[PDB]
Symmetry: C3
């Protein structure tokens, strides 16, 4: 069986004083199509393969292509994936929950470098022999994630830096906890990064959380992000504040809102301020199909 | 929801004395696939996104890729589209009705340069930040079209030439009228082009029309195309004559026929003569799927 | 109508002493998606078009694209195809039946150069004007194949070498015979190649066959491959031995097995030895979707 799914989004993206001779406000948009092939068996083992075709405004050649494939095998809550895999630091819960606006962005996201699923081709040639293995285990309320990425699998193993990641999250109706650790993140020797977060659903309607990171070799140093969101019917209001250890950095913050226009159609906007005083804003729509 | 549609065509394409050491007759063919994602809402607003994958004989690398995305929102007869849009001069009725043969070609089509939906990627890099907005309004028998294209939306607005177009058409059972005007067509300063056309369905079976153009900065100058077609059961016969103002040009003309082999399968052929005496012919099949 | 089908495969591929500083064992995988558009008519003539998107580990840019299109028309057992066609030497029965392992490989396959369907784009530009015509006729038990490939159809016909192929196979419940001949195979003047094979289903469970080739200008010279396979319930065991005329070559051989895990899911592995003493092994899974 083959299924197709995806989303389109478009809106306005503003970056205060973007550059000499550049418009500060542009129309930013994205089309994402996922192609998933799955083979179910009566033994209960499912096999799957996925390809993505994603276009973003500004993409070279005004064209769209597929990325590198991902393959998986699932059985009894356990999933093993190979190729262009989802990594542990990128898949744990809570770590991206301060994002807002129609492009799901936040200065409060981790300021470190690490491997993650590659949505597109890479013209530099750097990903040509990139290969990962990931294992996930979902055991009710608990999620475990393990990932191993070799950026160049054809070359002798001791000549390249491989990334090893581990993560777990846990939740009930009111509290959630999550932690992750990755050594040689992004294939950079000694770039060891870590995350610990927690969130409290202080209602049926609100949530408040705190994420802490060790950003490894990044110049940002350690980081803390405090965020919250509250739903009033179809409208959701979001906010965050984030601090990094880099000398002289400003406190980053953001405020945004979402409006659920219909099932699968969401209008979102945000106004945010960065660690170097950058001001960014956006307003747009995303529709899922 | 995601749907796929398209067409394949193949046949013989003859160009008298095509070039030293070249075959005059080749097998010309095209595969077009459209991928359309749509999200309908109970409020009556539809959201859509489309991508095209088109291959033509001769394409570089013997490969096929997607083009840049188009997004739209429709409500009550009004459609707003963004990104790789259909433009007013290219979407009005009548302007391409002298086309014939299995590749829908005619020297009687406008001999001007203007933006239109881009079916493929562009390796020159020229379309990378190209972005348009279009608005169409279909109000029974009447169609209005407006389009605005900025060929490089990231650069300051006064540093690039944007194309603005407007058009309308109108029809009843027997007469049709259409007009279009576009300033700085193709992003070329002062290339202002215009079209006015009319057609008469002088039966249930025949139609005769006349299109007039102002080709802006093109060397062709003003142009007039007179065409007609007549259906005899499954067979359609077509003809046209066209004249341009360029000094010394020949009168262009063409004669062709279509045969409706089955629903979605059409066999077509034509013999045509250009403004510089070029002789071209074709015969082939198109099938829609 | 548009349908999608394909397969994913992944596993381990070992090549003894692959190269200085290279891993001998890698994770080799492939994702293949076929997109087929078909138009059926009440006259009984079917029209079709197909595109393939295939990714293999190691592919340049870590991306996937479509290949060049193939078009066909079928009526009463006869199929005419144009564009990126299947060729006679590549489509006859028996010629690849010694293959084994999850990548369907065998040193006992013909060691000659010839055109075949191109699964991917070609960055060299060599296939840009490549165009073939093929005709197949399936007349109960009998299959005839004819193919003509012009590697550069736009250039004068006497300036390029075209490949012409013919083949036939025939089978009943127990015996199968097949033969093929291709002149100027691969567009190489005087590279004339030929195949003759036969197989005997010495049970409901086993088969033994012998293929002979004339490899044209290849340095391998003539070749003979003897192979067999036997099914024990869900498990199939395969073997082959092959000899070429090249001076000093070793006898190539291979032994493998397949396990039918479920409909559409097959686990396969093989250990093989080449004409230059290369040792190769593989174990993996293929799943069809
Ligand atoms: C096989 C899938 C198609 C992907 C191949 C595209 C290869 C194009 O690059 C060739 C080398 O030139 C470098 C291109 O510039 C960077 C492009 O991508 C960045 C997205 O905006
Ligand atoms: C023309 C350039 C500016 C384009 C940016 C659009 C920015 C618009 O969005 C502003 C951010 O929206 C957040 C509002 O704060 C929440 C208000 O109170 C909650 C109920 O709506
Ligand atoms: C008319 C000249 C072009 C100047 C361009 C400015 C046009 C602004 O956008 C108009 C339509 O397209 C884009 C944005 O989508 C709107 C955002 O979110 C939805 C409703 O709150
Ligand atoms: C991202 C979609 C893939 C499109 C990228 C292809 C880029 C190839 O070009 C790289 C630069 O070299 C120039 C190519 O020659 C022109 C090709 O297109 C013309 C169609 O026949
Ligand atoms: C071998 C090179 C020539 C390939 C070109 C094929 C050209 C064939 O088509 C000729 C054009 O067909 C138009 C006929 O005029 C209409 C006739 O009367 C109407 C009822 O059929
Ligand atoms: C046999 C040597 C190759 C010489 C090539 C000429 C072959 C001509 O075309 C044969 C089949 O393929 C293409 C054309 O489709 C026919 C056109 O329209 C349909 C019926 O009127
Ligand atoms: C139009 C479909 C996209 C295919 C175009 C890709 C073109 C990229 O090449 C541009 C020129 O540079 C040469 C690339 O190196 C070889 C790539 O393919 C081999 C597969 O591993
Ligand atoms: C770690 C590198 C080695 C990876 C190669 C895996 C090779 C494994 O497969 C060995 C080949 O399998 C063939 C067995 O011979 C058939 C046995 O008897 C029949 C019933 O199973
Ligand atoms: C753990 C460090 C990484 C070392 C890589 C070796 C891992 C070997 O493969 C594990 C999973 O992925 C690949 C192979 O599929 C297995 C083959 O066939 C199926 C069962 O017989
Ligand atoms: Mg953008
Ligand atoms: Mg063509
Ligand atoms: Mg491989």
């Amino acid at each position: 069986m083959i299924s197709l799914n995806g989303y389109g989004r478009f809106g306005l993206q503003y970056v205060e004083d973007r550059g000499v001779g550049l418009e500060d406000t542009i129309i930013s948009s994205r089309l994402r199509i996922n192609i998933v092939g799955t083979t179910e068996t009566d033994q209960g083992v499912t096999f799957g393969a996925k390809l993505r075709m994603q276009w973003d405004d500004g993409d070279a050649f005004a064209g769209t292509a597929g990325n590198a494939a991902q393959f998986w095998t699932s059985y009894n809550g356990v999933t093993v994936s190979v190729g262009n895999v989802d990594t542990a630091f990128d898949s744990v819960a809570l770590t991206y929950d301060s994002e807002m606006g129609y492009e799901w962005s936040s200065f409060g996201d981790a300021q470190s470098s690490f491997f993650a699923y590659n949505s597109k081709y890479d013209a530099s040639g750097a990903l040509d022999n990139y290969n990962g293995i990931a294992v996930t285990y979902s055991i009710s309320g608990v999620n475990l994630y393990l990932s191993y990425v070799d950026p160049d699998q054809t070359v002798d193993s001791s000549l390249v830096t491989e990334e090893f990641g581990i993560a777990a999250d846990w939740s009930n109706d009111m509290i959630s906890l999550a932690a992750a650790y990755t050594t040689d993140a992004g294939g950079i020797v000694d770039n060891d990064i870590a995350f610990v977060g927690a969130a409290y659903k202080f209602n049926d309607a609100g949530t408040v959380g705190l994420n802490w990171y060790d950003n490894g070799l990044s110049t940002a140093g350690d980081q803390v992000t405090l965020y919250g969101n509250y739903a009033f019917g179809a409208t959701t209001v979001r906010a965050y504040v984030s601090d990094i250890d880099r000398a002289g950095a400003d406190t980053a913050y953001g405020i945004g809102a979402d409006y659920q226009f219909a099932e699968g159609v969401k209008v979102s906007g945000s106004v945010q301020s960065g660690f170097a005083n950058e001001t960014v804003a956006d307003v747009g729509v995303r529709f899922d199909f």
